[PDB]
Each structure stands twice: as structure tokens, then as C-alpha cells.
Amino acid sequence: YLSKYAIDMTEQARQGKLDPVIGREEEIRSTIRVLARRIKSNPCLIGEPGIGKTAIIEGVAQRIIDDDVPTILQGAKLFSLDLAALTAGAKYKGDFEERFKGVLKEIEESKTLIVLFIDEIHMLMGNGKDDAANILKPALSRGQLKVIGATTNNEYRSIVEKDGAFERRFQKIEVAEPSVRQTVAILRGLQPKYEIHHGVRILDSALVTAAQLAKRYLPYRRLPDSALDLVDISCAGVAVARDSKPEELDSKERQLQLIQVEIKALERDEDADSTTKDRLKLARQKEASLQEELEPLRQRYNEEKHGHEELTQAKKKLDELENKALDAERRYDTATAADLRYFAIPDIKKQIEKLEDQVAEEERRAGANSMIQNVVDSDTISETAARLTGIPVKKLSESENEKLIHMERDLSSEVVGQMDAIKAVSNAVRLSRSGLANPRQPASFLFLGLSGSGKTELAKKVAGFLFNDEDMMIRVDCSELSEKYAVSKLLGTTAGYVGYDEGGFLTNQLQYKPYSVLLFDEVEKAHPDVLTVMLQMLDDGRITSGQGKTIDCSNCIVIMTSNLGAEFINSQQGSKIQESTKNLVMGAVRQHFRPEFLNRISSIVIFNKLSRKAIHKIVDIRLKEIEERFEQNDKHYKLNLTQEAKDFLAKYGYSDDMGARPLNRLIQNEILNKLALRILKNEIKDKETVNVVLEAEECLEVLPN
Amino acid sequence: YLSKYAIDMTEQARQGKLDPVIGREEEIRSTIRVLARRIKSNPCLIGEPGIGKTAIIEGVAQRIIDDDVPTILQGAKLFSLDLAALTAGAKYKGDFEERFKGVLKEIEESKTLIVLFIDEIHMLMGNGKDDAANILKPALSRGQLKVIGATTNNEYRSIVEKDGAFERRFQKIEVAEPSVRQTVAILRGLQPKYEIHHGVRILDSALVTAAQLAKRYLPYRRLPDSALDLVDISCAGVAVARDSKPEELDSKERQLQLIQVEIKALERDEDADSTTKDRLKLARQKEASLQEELEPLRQRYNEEKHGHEELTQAKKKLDELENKALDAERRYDTATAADLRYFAIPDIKKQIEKLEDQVAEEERRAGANSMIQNVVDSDTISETAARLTGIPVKKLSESENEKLIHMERDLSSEVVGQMDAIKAVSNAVRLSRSGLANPRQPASFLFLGLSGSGKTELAKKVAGFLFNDEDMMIRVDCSELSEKYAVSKLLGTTAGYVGYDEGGFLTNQLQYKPYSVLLFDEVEKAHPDVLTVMLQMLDDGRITSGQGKTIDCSNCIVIMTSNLGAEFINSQQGSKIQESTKNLVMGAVRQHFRPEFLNRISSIVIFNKLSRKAIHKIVDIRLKEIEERFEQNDKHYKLNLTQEAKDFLAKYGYSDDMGARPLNRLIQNEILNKLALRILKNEIKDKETVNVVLEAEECLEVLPN
Ligand SMILES: Nc1ncnc2c1ncn2[C@@H]1O[C@H](COP(=O)(O)OP(=O)(O)O)[C@@H](O)[C@H]1O
Ligand SMILES: Nc1ncnc2c1ncn2[C@@H]1O[C@H](COP(=O)(O)OP(=O)(O)O)[C@@H](O)[C@H]1O
């Protein structure tokens, strides 16, 4: 029977068993217009699967119930036919086929216009036709059977390369991820569902931050989903908080126990006549005192709890009344709609407001009540995210804009000098955003000046501030870009060719890190073909993967690096790269890259010869970096390098061969080895001081012990 | 019929029998949070076999027991439904299905929210899915039918990838292995259960050491359970060792009984009256003397045992009274709580205090009388470990610091030559072990140098030293790691391809050895991709399979050997390698590997030519080794190596083309073979100790008689 597994979605939705659908109307209308088409009556939802898409289909079911359809579809009924219909519904080979033909024939059989839909449209045609109604359904569609399908970009793209008839039969509609703003409106629409689900209110701001954070920190998941995860999760987290009632009750009740236990113990003994044991009477006074606290505590918890329960039920009833009104209105049973629309629905609205007054959010806190409700925009959602993303509130709390005026400073704290570079970079980061640059034109730079200048480290630190994650960066070995430029290429292995490794670095990492910075290590050595795909990446960087052939590029900040101007930089005797010298570098830039590439870069930036005066500061930054993390602070050298270690390190550090790079071999192989030893030998146990105990570099720093 | 189909975990918790665990409170709150979630309502505990998933859920049930569960779930009941419930009832296809549906109907209607727990998600779906719940279950989710699942990280990924359905209703909860510290706390929590079962009290420090030992020596076993395995096993060890009541007694009772029988046999005999047999009277004095010691041992053990059992029961009873009293207080039934708190509880608590005082404890032991059977923290655990892992004495003598302190010395006593290297390596290891180094990256170094000169032998000795086991090393033939790198790459084959020994050579061995030494033989010849893969999982040692399973052995010391510097080694510029020849080598290193590789290695060693000075001595050392290897006391040669053997061997030994390598052959070819001949003659009973007496290499040793 069709009744097995096929779900009458219009009946389901009619019964109020369908969530309201918000902000999809254009896609829904498109779907309906397709169903209306006399020939190509079969729409298909395409795009990114985390977006769900199904709500659109369900939106159609709702339109059918309410008949907000073209009337040629007035008699339509919409059914969900999927998975279990062919899988759980089958025991032996061939049952699969019968579930199709059996049901589908019943679908044709007389009972008005039936539209079916399959959310995994890909289940049909299997992985290579096998008549998983691959032919049958089309045959049946000749016989009216209108079908709504849903798929993914990966799926139909493979389908049309194996078939193509599907495409000829289907009107693909891509489902767009809603903007955060749209998402919030959506969340508001769904807000009472979640409030009901958990017995909590949700701060409107929380709806906002859920969308913002879902988007900002969990972008790998499509926003409608991710946002709702923050909502239902955070709401549940609050529901868990709503069961913290016992923490106060048990504190007092456990104290009653200790007292009740002592009272009998105290009641009879050799010393019963002494004030030592007669304290029993005081124990009873304390047992009573705790009861005095427990009475208003328990009463408060229950009064407030009831206010939340009543609020919740009022919201449930408002929604049930509206569901019924909507049914009655299309039925033209407006008298019964009136029973809901007049007085009842608005009265419940007013009951809800009064019940929120019982919840009593007050100037004292987010709910005067002890239930703890009101998902908090900041702390609740943020911590929810912390549970999902990790990293502390700083990550989760920013004005954003402010980074331009703080991050450039903090960056100068992380790396020494290069302030002009820092400003240039910082500027593109916040200004490309606030400047509303084409969103597919993320900040991008070419980092010139030489290795050892920290230009790379800057970018790393920038990732730090941009994403609260230095390891957000995607590094690309551009020197490993020979004529083969295959898997390692931004595109990776071409679809259908051997090797499923695609987008060597780019897909492979952006798919996990959509918000990221990418860095091209010695980009100057890249094969021109790569430089060409990079050109694309630098502007409208819509890079298509090797196998999937999908694109996901936006906030993909790009830093390219080179030692391209080295002779010019070597010539420079000062710090700030001199005029003309910089032009010599530009000459070389133009030799290596075409203007069409270069013009896409937010800025070409040449890093300065920071020299001694800078490394003199770098050594403190590095030194404290090491100790600041350490393990646990049960040590703490004064970190008093003094000019001895600072300068010996600088001399042993800032080599023109690699600038400051040796610094991180220094320390390690000069003192850290000793720290470990002296500490593990139990010579050194806490604190300590830094100084130098005086062949090349033979003093080797050597700290006090 | 549910009781046929599943175990009421919650009721069992009411009945106890579910040992409580700690350290999973967040997992539990999360489980609950998910269960509270109304959309993705079903949690899964994902981790490792033995990760904690079972107890976590039983802990969840405990939250139900004590009303620490939100109103949504508060009245819920938890059942364990698995294996027997899934397949034992199968006689034909159909039991599972009807049994399954039966359950779902019973847990859904009327009888609150009965929640199911699937202990093994593996059993769901299974090999081919077969609607083993997985299809109808979520289809039926409209009935809530709340369920908790659990599996491993690896299996989890494969089921999600195959599914895309339960995924949409479930919330993954990752379960971390508890730290050693956490584990110990847990061990303490369960210690009584062991002490109770076994009749073996255990010194607290045992638990401390057990967790340490478990992590350290029971490679693939997880702490919350494997530590217990050491406990359970060692408890049993003691339980067995004590045999007849405590240790000491058993052995003396065995003497007593052997004596008792002898005496009685002597008492009635042909010559019983002769001093030949009448000596039984003195044997009787021994029987009696033993009896006089044995009785106190028995009595101390037994009376204390009685107290031990009384403590066992008293503590159980204490918990029962509090559990019931809590039920009473959460219901506000102060009368019942009082009945279970006044007298009830003072009685049990005082029994416990009195009993513990009667048992009493000493600094030497957690039981002043006998019910400890002299169990000793590390000694008895270590011996347990020795039985499980071997190397008794060095496992006993395992101080981290005795090693770290003398590390380079001890290593130099085994390895002779570039002691500087030994120091360098030692230091790197110290940094790693000390946590001074970034804890994600174990020490590792490039290892160049003259062949046949102990480069890998050092690694063996390091492994020896660090693990008390030369077998701890894993070796990699890097030259075979051409572009082909597949089953042979660390990750192994990409899952989905034929063959699942995915880096078995690498990853699985690494799995078996989570603390280890790994050496790359001719790392310079590895394909750049391989080097990259290694590098990426070299620092931040996230060893990961083709299925995405990470071993993460941040504890592996890695050696990256090659012949890269051979052209400079061949310069023969001294024994200790002349400075600047080393620079040329390092130049070559810098050119043979991308600097990024070199940016992560912790160090580099280029082994010195030993010259005649050292090899003349080294050979003597291996001759010692040969004897050390020998199985019995009929050798123990000094071997008259005088100078002549050292010279013979040196002359025909230390070649630039193979170094000391062929010395085992010289020794074998001439020494062992000549010994074999004489041994064969069997005219040798001990010592041997012979010298060199004589075309090519004419001395040929040739040993005397
Ligand atoms: N504006 C919205 N209003 C209601 N639901 C929405 C809205 N936007 C997205 N959704 C739905 O939330 C659900 C998340 O996807 P879901 O349907 O659960 O997964 P899938 O369709 O892949 O099985 C989808 O139906 C999605 O369409
Ligand atoms: N605080 C700092 N300011 C500027 N540079 C720094 C700072 N700390 C470290 N560095 C240097 O930045 C460099 C990062 O490497 P990089 O310059 O890109 O060299 P390479 O291109 O050889 O990898 C290192 O030389 C590192 O020491």
C-alpha cells in the first residue's frame, strides 16, 4: 500500500506537524510554478545539503493545504516517498521494484492529482540507473505524476553526466543560504518552538548572535542548521540549567541531613547531659532554620516554574489555535476560524505577555526567577559555541570593527616593526569588509622583503586575530608546483581521473576552514598555470574543486610570499625599505607576475629590514611566548635577558641568511635544554633568573642555575 | 515484554550493582542536554573501546535516579537493549523486527519516555544495514522513542558516511580518555569494589602508580578500564598469591601440612620408635611453631576480614539509606527522609568509624593487621605488568629521572663515539619528556654519519633506555616510498580501496607502540609527498590512518637517517667531524629538504668517524655482548682478545664503506666458528678464553685449545 512509508505531508502539515517556513517563498513559488508547468512539471532543489531544502518542499505542502497554489494544482496532494519505502520496505531483491511500482501505481490510481517528492532524489537512479525508478518514474511522469526532487550540487552534477534525461525532465532551483539577517528572521519565526521545547525564553539578541556565531564560527555547516544547532543546543543547555533547582535545594536539604543525622546521634550518650551533646537542641533549631530557607526557596522555585510552564502552555495554545484557524479558513468554515481568530488567539497573546511578567525578567538579572531562562546572546550562545568551537569568550566577544584600531597594534605587539605592512594588511581586512568590496574579493597581499623579516609570521599572527586561530591558515608549498600541477593544485585531480584528492590545499582545507587565510609559500616559483588559477583566486576566487567540481570561496584572505626582491633588499642598508629600492622590487614583481594578477592584490607590501633594534625586542616577545605558555606557572624565570642575552641572541639570531629565523634554534639549543635538565635534576624548582655565563658563539648564553 | 527485550538500567541503579564512576559529569550533562534537545534529540558517545561510554550512560541513569534530569526527561527510564535483544532471538529473519517494533511501541505509549541505550552501534545497521533498527527507528522517531547510542570514533565516521540519516537526529558527543590523574581519582572511587571483591586492601599509591603504569605500558588499552585491569589483575594477583588467607601464612601452612603428614607417617612405622623416625617430635615442634605463627596470621586476616566485610556492607547500606532519603527529600517527604536519617545513617556511619579503627592502618600498609596481604603499590603492580609486558627489574627501576639525569651517560656506556650527539639527543628527549618543548611535538632529528657506526644502534639504545626495550623501535624503508606510497604511506590505502592494512607497517605498529622510537631509513629518498606527510605528522605527531583514525603519538622519538652528508663524511677530516665540513653537509640538508621540513625537526646529528681509537674498544664491547647473549654458565669467557683480536678485527673492521658492521661477521666468521668447532669437539667445559694465533687476513683469529 501507498500508506506504507509514503507520508501525506499535507495531512501532516494540516495537523500542525510541520514547522512554519520562513524566507523561502521565492524558491517555493519557483517550485510551484514548475509543478504548474504542463511539460516540465518536475522541480528540483539543488545547492548545499546542510541548508536542508526540504522545508521548501514542506512549504509547498502547506500551500496545498491552504491552497495558496495555482488552482490547476488545487486538487494536489503531496507525499514524502523515500528511504524506508525502498529499504526497510524491502526484504528480497525485487521488493525494491515492487515498492516503487506498487506504490506508484496506487499514486496514479484515481485519487486526484498527486505530487510526490524525494529528498534524496539521488536514491533514484541509484549510483548508475539500475531502474531505481530511473525509467519507471519518468514513464509514470508521462502519466501525470509530478515529482519534486532534492539533491546536492555534487549529486545532480554526477547524475547529469550519467544520464542527462533527468535534467531534461527537471527544473533545478538552487536553494540559497539565507543571510544572517534573514536567518534571524527565520529564527524568530521558529523562536516560540524552541521556547516551548525547553521552557525558556530566548533573547531576541540571542537569536541574532546564534545566527552570527553560527555563521562566524561554524560556517562549515549551513547557517539554517548551524543557527538552529546553537538555538536548540543552547536552549537545552538552559533546560539543563533549569534543572539546577536542586543545587540550592540540596545544599539546604543535605544540610538538613547532616543535622538530622547528628540529632539522633546527639540524643543519647554518656555525655548527653553536657552542652557537648545538648547542642542537639541547636541542631533542631538549625534543622528548622534550613526548613525556613527551604520553604520560600522551594515555593519560589515552584511559583516561578509554574509561571514558565503556564507561559509555555499559552504559547502552545496560541499556535494550536492558529493551526486550526488556518485549516478552517481554507475550508471556508470561517465560523470555526472565527472561534479562534476573534478573542482566543489574541487573548492567548495577552496571556503570554502576562505570563512573561510572572517569569519576571527584571533589572536585577536575566530572569528574576531562579529557573534561569532567556537564552543570553552573549554568555549562553557564546558558551554554547565554546562547547562547540572551544576558545574563550574573547573569541566569542568583539565589536569586530574595533580590530582595525586594536589589531594593528596588537599585531605590532606580536611582530616587531613592519608597521606600514601591518597597517596595509589590517586595513584590507576590516576595510574590505566595511568598504563592502565584492565579497569574492577578500583581502590579499604580496609579501616582499626577505625571509626572516617575519612577513609570514605576520600573516600567521593575523590569522590569530582574524579567527582567534593562528592555525586557521592554509599554507601552500608553491615551490612544489612543477608542470604536473595536479593534486597539489588549487583544483587538484580532475573529475573522473585517478585520485580523489582534490584541491590539494585549498579544497582540502577550506572545506573545514571557509573563513581563513591562505598563504602561498614562495609564490614566485609557482608554475604559470598555477599563477593563473591563483589570479582567479585573487578576484572572484570561485575555485572549482578537482572531483566534486564545487566552489566555496569568500573570506579566503590571501598572502603570497617571495624573496623576489632579494638583491634590492640586500642592497638596502637602512630599515624602512628606501624609495627606488622598492621600485626595483616592483620591477622584479612585474617580471614575475602579470599586471592582471598584481592588480587583484589589495596591496603589494615590502617588508622592512628590521635589524638589531627590532630583534632586540623580538627576543623578549619570543622568550615570553615560550614561558607564557610553558605548562603551568610553577617556574617563571625573570626573563631578564639583559642586554647580554638580548644582543648575543640578536647577533646569533638576525642573520641576513634568514633574518631572525635562527632565533628559534637559539634558546632551544642554548638554554631550554638546560632548563629541562636542571629542573628535572631537582636543582631548579621554581622562579630563576636569566643572564649569560660568559669557538664561534662559545659562551652559548647559559643561564644561572 | 520490554523486560525480555531490554535491561532496566535505571532500576538496576535503584538496586545498585552498577559501579559508579566519576569524571564524566560533562559527558553526562551533555548526554542529557541532547536528550532534552527536541530536534537532534539522540546523543551518541563516541570514542574508543573502553573509553568510558558504558559507565557514562549508567551515570546518566544515575542522574535519572536522583532527579538530576530536567522535567522533560526527569520521569524517563533507561534500558540497555542489545545483542541478545537483537540477534539471540533470531531463529529466522523476523524476531529482530517484531521484537524491535514491540519495544518501540511499549517505550512510546503510556509508560513515560523509555529511553533505549545502544551499547554497540556496530550492531545497528551491521554489514549491509539490513534495517537493523536504523531505518525504521528514525522513521518512528515521531514517537520520540529516545535513544542513546555509542561507538568508536572510527566506526562512527563510517556509519555516518554510509548513513546521512541518524546523523540528522543525533548529536555526537566525543569522549576523551581521562587523564592519568582523573583515572586515579576514578580508581580511588572504585578501589573499594576491588578491595571488597578480592579481600585485598590496597595502598593508595598503588592506584596512583597503576594509572601511570597502564598508560605507560598497556599500549592500546584505555585508562578508565586498563588501569582497572591492572588493578583487577593485580588484585587477583594478590588474591592468588595470598592463597590460604594472607601471604606469609600460606607458605608456612604448606610447610606445616607437609610436616604434619610426615610426622603422622613417621608416628606409625616399623621403626617409629627409632630416632630415625621419632625425629617427628621435633618436626612436631616445627608444626606447632608454625601453627602459632599461622594462627595469628589467620586470625588477624579473618577478624580484619570480618571488619572488611562489615565495612563493605556498611558502606553499601549507607548509600542505600541516603539514596532512599534523597528520594524522600526531593518529594519533600521529610518524614521518610528522617526515618532514613535519624538513627538510620548514624548507625552505619558509626559502624564504619569503629570498624576502620579496629582494622587500623600503618605507614607500611593500608591495613595494620593482615587484609592487605602486603600488597605494594608499584612492586606488586610492576610485577603484574612484568607478567603482562615483561622486563621485571627495569620496570621496577623505571624512574623518569634516574633516566633523564644519567641519560647521556648511560647511553654513552652503550654507545661510543659522537657522545655529543648523544648529548644533543638526550637533551631533546629531556625537553620532550619535561614538557618544556611544545608537548605536541616529540624530539626528532636528522641522522647523518658514517655507516656501520652505531647510528641506528644508538636509536636502539635510546629505545632500549627509554622503554627498557630495543624492540620499541619501528623502522621505515623510506626508499620504497616512491610516488606509489599507498598502503605504505602512514595513512595507508585510502579507505574504499582494496586492502585495509592501512599503514599497518606504520600506523598499526605505532598504535601498538604509543610511546616509541621511530626511525626513517634513508629519509632523503622518500618521495617529497611522503616526507610532507611525515612532516605534518612529525611535529604535532597526529599519526592518522586512511580512515582518519589518529594515534597521535606525540611520544615518539623520531630519527631521520640518510647518507646525505656522505660526500663530506668521506673527506675524513678528523674523527670528530671537522667544523665547516658539517656546514657543507647542512647546506646539502637545506637543499635536499624544503626548509619547512627543517623548520620542524628538533635537531641534526652527523656521526663521527670513530677511528681506531674508539673502534678498537667498541669491538671489545660487542664481544662482551656476545657473551651476555649467551644462555648458560659454561662459557663466561674473558676471551683473550688482548690486543691482537682488537687489532685483527679493527684491521678487517672499520671501513668507510660499512664501518663496524662486518665485525659481527668477523666475529662470527672467525671467532664464533672456531669456538663452534671446539665446542663441537666438546672438550670444553667452561671459560674457553682463547686468542688470535696466526691468505687474506691470515691471522684469522684461530683460537687455541
Ligand atoms: N526558514 C526556515 N523555516 C523553517 N525551516 C527551515 C527554514 N530554513 C531552513 N529550514 C529547515 O530546517 C531543516 C534543516 O534541514 P533538514 O530538513 O532537517 O535536513 P535535510 O532536508 O537534509 O533532511 C530543513 O528542512 C531546512 O529546510
Ligand atoms: N616578533 C617577531 N617579529 C618579526 N619577526 C619574527 C618575530 N618573531 C619571530 N619572527 C620571525 O619571523 C620569521 C618567520 O619565518 P619567515 O620569516 O617567514 O621565514 P622563512 O620564509 O624562511 O620561513 C622567523 O624568522 C621568525 O623568527
Ligand SMILES: Nc1ncnc2c1ncn2[C@@H]1O[C@H](COP(=O)(O)OP(=O)(O)O)[C@@H](O)[C@H]1O
Ligand atoms: N572506572 C570506569 N570509568 C569509566 N568507565 C568504566 C569504568 N569502569 C568500567 N567502565 C566502563 O566499561 C566500559 C568498558 O567495558 P564495557 O562496559 O563492556 O564497555 P566497552 O564496550 O567500552 O568495552 C567502558 O566504556 C566504561 O564505560
Ligand SMILES: Nc1ncnc2c1ncn2[C@@H]1O[C@H](COP(=O)(O)OP(=O)(O)O)[C@@H](O)[C@H]1O
Ligand atoms: N660505538 C658504537 N656503539 C654501538 N654500536 C656501534 C658503535 N660503533 C659502531 N657500531 C655499530 O654500527 C653497527 C650498525 O651501524 P649503524 O650505523 O647503526 O647501522 P646501518 O649502517 O646498518 O644503518 C652496529 O653493529 C653497531 O654496533
